[PDB]
């Protein structure tokens, strides 16, 4: 269920067990034919909770479900890689371009990952490609950059929601470490297909996490890793359920289910972008806009009337790809003004 | 040629040894191949060049053994470009983009070989690299401006479920949406001809080799105005063009 809708009615669905100590666990994965992101998690619950593929109305949402028998609130994110999201972005508006169409979904992935990494005890990444996805790690570094930029405004929202003095677990965090979060999540990774093998990806997983300044950066870290207990697991098409309980039982539950309901309600501002500045473009959007502004300046230089306006058009017809119709017609006006 | 030879020398300059390798014929076809490391792209492109499945490993024409590099090979008048794998930080992405943009401009069709199709990161690279463009207005013969480079996505080392017709069309759709608004890239709109899946079989490469020659669009405004030997002078004028250089600088700037 969508977390925006989960919160509205959670206080009444579990009206009895509001004082039960639970964990919040985030899940990152991709949908594949006959295998959805949460297929390993719904197999851990012996109940297929999440679908084998996200539907159009489930795109770009954190799908929440709370298992009261294990006292865990599982959070799976439907991101930009779902078939239903790539479909819904590239036909939602035929009068748009590819870059802006996926930019909005790429931003919501950033907010949802920002949502998980400030409210989840653990976060499990599922990978099948046999290689650690390095563009997930660029997402996580943009997420950690956005977190640093908005941790002050989110911390005052945890103060207003009475959650800043609510403990998430044993660990005490400095004001620099705790600002904008309730936890520095412990990050885990599960690969889908030999003991020295899993040890070789642990050091691998660690070093790439440091290359993007995601661990071992103090208050600037986005997550952390365990000290003794394994972080990496290998699945086969159950050794896996024991790998989670080793991580889950290493931390006695502490946060009440009620204060988690109000946490997901408090951090809705992160999913809605209520704290961000207006008109924030992606790195690719800024690249497109800056070279298109340069193409307009060089075409005006080519004009500096009939022959001068046939080389400025033929140049923009050669170099400008997106918004080509608007760019050409907007230059017919800039050479009309220069004709005065 | 017995095997593949380096298309570039140092600093991304075109090797002077390949110019004598070309002919004065306008009946040439250039087909590049891009993709990640372990996709088998070099082994696969070797068999559209004419290698049989039973041939030895030392007999493969594209044996993958200097930051950037492209491997050239020509049978008949068929020019095959094998690019170095895609994969640091800014420079790793800036270099990948620099070679992809160059190969989309000088190829009739480019083979996108991967095990991850549909992979949004690959489409992202393809769609921004297409905006890395030169301005070869003074080139003679005048070159086609509305011309689209054909892309053929190939899913290597795939499982049986990747061969399901329902799964191919699902990803083929996402590929035709990813280029519906493309200006200089094109993808076919025939089912089972935009995403080709292989389980890693010679009767598929022979059919594919016959098919890579149909939707090729000429580089020039007038038919048969550029021979393959002058095709390289277009390549030299692409890597030197200042409008292209400035655009790549603004890409790296936006990535930092």
Residue numbers in the entry:
A (entry chain A): 1 to 193, 211 to 254, 289 to 355, 384 to 419
B (entry chain B): 59 to 123, 134 to 155, 172 to 284, 308 to 363
Show the paper's wording.
The SMG1 kinase is an essential NMD factor in metazoans and is associated with two recently identified and yet poorly characterized proteins, SMG8 and SMG9. We found that SMG8–SMG9 is a G-domain heterodimer with architectural similarities to the dynamin-like family of GTPases such as Atlastin and GBP1. SMG8 and SMG9 interact with each other and inhibit the kinase activity of SMG1 in vitro. Nucleotide binding occurs at the G domain of SMG9 but not of SMG8.
We proceeded to obtain the structure of a nucleotide-bound SMG8c–SMG9c complex. Although the SMG8c–SMG9c crystals cracked when soaking GTP, GDP soaking experiments were successful. Diffraction data to 2.65 Å resolution showed the presence of well-defined electron density for a GDP moiety in SMG9c but not in SMG8c. GDP binds SMG9c at a similar position as in Atlastin and GBP1, in particular with similarities at the phosphate-binding loops, e.g., at the motifs G1 (P loop), G2 (switch 1), and G3 (switch 2). In SMG9c, the P loop residues Lys99SMG9 and Ser100SMG9 coordinate the phosphates of GDP. Although parts of the switch regions are disordered in our GDP-bound structure, the switch 2 residue Asp150SMG9 is at the position expected for coordinating the magnesium ion, while the switch 1 residue Thr135SMG9 is 10 Å away from the position expected upon γ-phosphate binding. First, there is a conserved proline residue (Pro153SMG9, disordered in the present structure) at the position of switch 2 typically occupied by a glycine. Second, there is a conserved glycine residue (Gly96SMG9) in the P loop at the equivalent position of the so-called arginine “finger” (Arg77Atlastin). At the corresponding position of Asp218Atlastin, SMG9 features a conserved lysine residue (Lys241SMG9) that stacks with its aliphatic portion on top of the guanine base. Fitting the GDP-bound SMG8–SMG9 structure in EM densities of the human SMG1–SMG8–SMG9 complex raises the possibility that the nucleotide site of SMG9 faces SMG1 and could impact the kinase conformation and/or regulation.
